[PDB]
Structures are given as C-alpha cells and as structure tokens.
Design a protein around this nucleic acid. Structure first.
Length: 92
DNA sequence: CACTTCCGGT
DNA sequence: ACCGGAAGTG
C-alpha cells in the first residue's frame, strides 16, 4: 500500500535512547521490551492515522510477524518481544 | 498487501 | 497478557 510498516516504525523507536521510556532494546539477542505499551500503541496509531489503536491491536500486529519470522515472543516475560534480523533480511 | 477490528479461548 | 482465526479497512 506504501504506508510505513510496523517493523520499520519499531526499529526507529528502538534506535533512539530518548524513547527508552516507552520502548528499548533489552535482554540481548534482538530482545526488546515495550516499557510503556499504551504509549507505543498511541504513537503507532498517530503515525498510521488510526486513533483507536491500542496495545490489543498492536500486539496482534506483532503476532502477525511471528509467521513471517520477523519477530517472536519472549515467553513469560511481560511486554517483551524479540526481533529476528535474519528473518527481516530473508523477507527482503 | 499489511495490517486493523473483533473477540472467544488459553 | 497472550494467542490466533476470521472478516474488514486504506
């Protein structure tokens, strides 16, 4: 469609320490955490033109990435996901 | 296409 | 919180 993709949006946030308040790399091996899921969802909505966006819908988008091998869940760790760069590369 | 909505189930 | 099927939006 041309619109910005979620993975790009998240990498941009994660590439700036200024955003550690809501999202940051943590744990290691591509692991990151949404330290403020509501905030991240708000930014995503605003950035995407979907004002009724929330973590419920955002996380669903993240889960959609599971099948694409672009991301996976850190099982048992609240709000903690894992970026798969090899998978991202294989998608290109 | 790449999500966004919705929501019953774990 | 997290999962994931199914139908809908730009």
């Amino acid at each position: 469609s041309g619109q910005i993709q979620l993975w790009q949006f998240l990498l941009e946030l994660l590439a700036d320490r200024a955003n550690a308040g809501c999202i940051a790399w943590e744990g290691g091996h591509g692991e990151f955490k949404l330290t403020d899921p509501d905030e991240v969802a708000r930014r995503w909505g605003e950035r995407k033109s979907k004002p009724n966006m929330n973590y419920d819908k955002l996380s669903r988008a993240l889960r959609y990435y599971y099948d694409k091998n672009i991301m996976s869940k850190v099982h048992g760790k609240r709000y903690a996901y894992r970026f798969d760069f090899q998978g991202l590369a294989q998608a290109c």
